[model samples]
Target: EAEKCTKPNEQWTKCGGCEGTCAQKIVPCTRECKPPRCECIASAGFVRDAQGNCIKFEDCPK
Candidate 1:
């Protein structure tokens, strides 16, 4: 999977995070998620879980 990823900046490594959201693999968001994999705004629509599982926002539990 690392081979399929790309570097978005020098400070970090970027990939098809959360299944194409560039959410990063080792960080955390304020409220949306836990540590070491926080989701960015682009991950709003859909994303994968920590286990590399794809999860559609529409399918997310409310």
Candidate 2:
């Protein structure tokens, strides 16, 4: 999805993080940083959403 969005300078519906639909619902970004992204929650094992800010999973609700 990232490739598709950046290749043509288009927008895409991003979920999960630097990687799309990551396994375990939470994981590290495997690609370069971009906009409209979400990373995995380290502690809660989910995506940490903070007003679109990429925060550590440990900070999210369990």
Candidate 3:
């Protein structure tokens, strides 16, 4: 049988250091200091540069 996931971003999971408070994807994890913890999905809109650092769309080099 196929199961449906109604809760998309509400599932609690281990924060990958980039997700904090389930609302701030770019921020640090506020729930726990390490893995194996329950946390929300990380938000989007984070554009990193070639250096792997977070950067705004306007700041992106052409």
Candidate 4:
């Protein structure tokens, strides 16, 4: 997919950070961010697994 950047606070369902989803992205800060407040990739569908394997959209659990 690798779409363009979304608005701030936009939910990225494919993100595996925080509560399994991330927001548009956040500036790195010295605090604990979680779930809906977590930083996310600029684009989706370019996800890689723990083994560095690409996760196709069809294979996405979401």
Candidate 5:
């Protein structure tokens, strides 16, 4: 079961995970798939910030 995503810009995703964060971009994921979990919404180009908050990739610190 998926828990409600409480973090800003986060959502409940069902399968696969290779999230892009502030320090790095989203890389190719391995064949090993992931399960239901809360992650940044990919469609919006959101990535995890230093505090794990989801924000636009362009806004990530340098």
Candidate 6:
């Protein structure tokens, strides 16, 4: 089987992470998720700037 995702600054994962909540620049994960899900790519060091689009921390909206 094959799959396609539309996450511009994120990736598909089966582990647990909290990058989805872009509101926080310094992401911290205590959540317990063990299933297929989408999360921001750590390398990007980015988050959804005001939910408009994926942007770097320095480029985050004011």
RMSD of each: 10.2, 11.1, 10.0, 10.6, 4.3, 4.7
User: What is candidate 5's lDDT per residue for 1-62, written digit by digit as tens?
Assistant: 55598876667777646667765666567865578777666555778777876788887787
lDDT per residue for candidate 6 within 1-62, as digits (tens), equals 32245755555656635553356665656665557766555444766666546556666645
Which residue runs of candidate 2 sit more than 4 Å off their true CA positions? 1-46
lDDT for predicted candidate 1 compared with the true structure: 0.36
Q: Which tens-of-lDDT digit does each residue in 21-56 have in candidate 4?
A: 122123344444444432334344333334433343
Ranking by TM-score: 5, 6, 3, 1, 2, 4
Clashes of 6: 0
Global CA lDDT computed for model 2: 0.38
Clashing pairs in 1: 27-36, 27-37, 27-38
Clash count, candidate 3: 0
Instruction: Looking at model 2, report the run of 10 residues with the lowest lDDT sum.
Output: 15-24
Q: Identify the runs in model 6 with alpha carbons over 4 angstroms from their true place.
A: 1-4, 20-24, 50-54
Ranking by lDDT: 5, 6, 3, 2, 4, 1
For residues 1-62, write the lDDT of model 1, one tens digit per residue. 33332432211223323233225423443443323333332333454444554455344444
What's the lDDT for candidate 4?
0.37
Give the deviation of candidate 6 from the true structure as CA RMSD.
4.7
TM per candidate: 0.24, 0.23, 0.29, 0.22, 0.52, 0.40
Off by over 4 Å in 4: 1-42, 57-62
* Residues 1-62 of candidate 3: C-alpha lDDT, one tens digit per residue: 32232443333444434543222336634665446443334443444455654444444576
Residue 21 displacement in candidate 3 (angstroms): 22
